[PDB]
Structure 1
């Protein structure tokens, strides 16, 4: 089918259901990169936070549509990617490095026992982090968190490796098998320890559902997503060579 992209709603928890996992990954129909998914819902938000559009990309977009000032049981927002012009030619002789970003939303786990932090002024804009609603890459303060993605694509072997990092720290390593202009593969959490409180680690679960495509006539760009095996995270990404 080649979906133009995907998007998920950020999980919202409650006393009745303290744990709410990732679910219902909607497929996007609409390739217009100036169109953000669920833009209409964001009118009501206290602080409409829609990840800004990177001027250097021409065929793909990944980001988030969220309330930057959420509270209580409000809807929080959505995470998505899209792309168009699935690649028809793929560079042959060359080994290409794609560089870009990634974004995510965690699951919601209101359970005090899980150990997620309520209050980290330096780190996030939101309180009760990942508890009342999933944590979104958008809630992080730029001074302490920057989510950058870098992939190595060898079209000869049809292999992809790469890293999803947070500033200087590696968070996931990725491996994919290229198959035409799509790809599939796995993301491996670099830190498997879940920890607690300030050091709590939202990124501890592997994923066998890494899946993306190449975009632009000559695969000048790439974008995809993946879902934690335990349904505790949903990540998207986008990049461009060289």
Structure 2
């Protein structure tokens, strides 16, 4: 069973202006300190690896990006991983999991797509999602905070939740629990891309939301989903209490 997944941020070109999410690799290394492709990150202008949440014992999600990206260079990777799949699951316990989520968009240089050239208030990067995919790591914490919320009913084998940006709800999640795994869908709260500085990178749904509970008594969870149109790849991890 796959311990996690890792995706490279899409990079577009002039006669390939639209490059979608692809090559979702399996992670066989379940060590939470081994960050996927960290050994390749030295060539980045600012090797930006998302902080490790030490309260998380079993799972980890985040990214490995060039935090000072330039032109058409490698942006980096988004991933999640978890070890010790749950073998005992609290039944009739109504658990609430709180954590984060991270993402990378596709790349789309087509001018008609109407992705913004400048949003310095929001991100550390220019030409948002045009040459290279937008990553959650790009956002300035003052304007964007990607948190996850999950309501899990082990009695009814049902999970609901929300992927939020600061206050705003970006996705609602629904999933069926099958053992220590879950599978389901992410529903985009906003279906319209819009245009310009109000361009919406999260307009597409996803029928491929899946992850697992990790740690003996299902103390933690992590997972991922891909947009049905490959425009986004998201990961998440959360702890219950």
- Name the TM-score, length of structure 1 as normaliser: 0.99
Shift of 1:16: 1.7
Distance 1:225 1:218 in 2: 21
How far does residue 60 in structure 1 lie from its aligned partner after superposition? 0.2
Deviation at 1:78, TM superposition (A): 0.3
1:237 matched residue in structure 2:
236
After superposition, the C-alpha distances for 1:79-118 in whole angstroms (9 at most, x for unaligned) are: 0000000000000121000000000000000011100001
How much has 1:124 moved relative to structure 2? 0.5
Q: In structure 2, how many angstroms separate the alpha carbons of the residues matched to 1:72 and 1:163? A: 34
- Equivalence map 1:156-195=2 (5 Å): 156-195=155-194
What's the C-alpha RMSD, in Å, of the aligned pairs?
0.5
1:62-92 deviation per Cα after TM superposition (whole angstroms, max 9, x unaligned): 0000000111110110000000000000001
Give me the whole-angstrom Cα distance separating, in 2, the residues matched to 1:93 and 1:173.
23
Question: Deviation of residue 14 (structure 1)?
Answer: 0.6
Q: Give the Å deviation of 1:39.
A: 0.8
Report the secondary structure of 2:41's partner residue: helix
Aligned to 1:135: 134
2: CA distance, partners of 1:119 / 1:171: 22
Taking the aligned partners of 2:134 and 2:92, their CA distance within structure 1 comes to 41
Deviation track 1:162-201 (CA, whole Å, cap 9, x = no partner) reads: 0000000000000000000001000000000110111100
Distance in 2 separating the partners of 1:103 and 1:183: 19
Unaligned runs of 5+ in 1: none
Aligned-residue offset at 1:40 = 1.4
Q: Match of 1:209, SS?
A: strand
Structure 1 residue 223: deviation in Å?
A: 0.2
The separation in 2 between residues aligned to 1:93 and 1:210, in whole angstroms, is 24
Q: How many residues align?
A: 241
How does 1:134-153 map onto structure 2 within 5 Å?
134-153=133-152
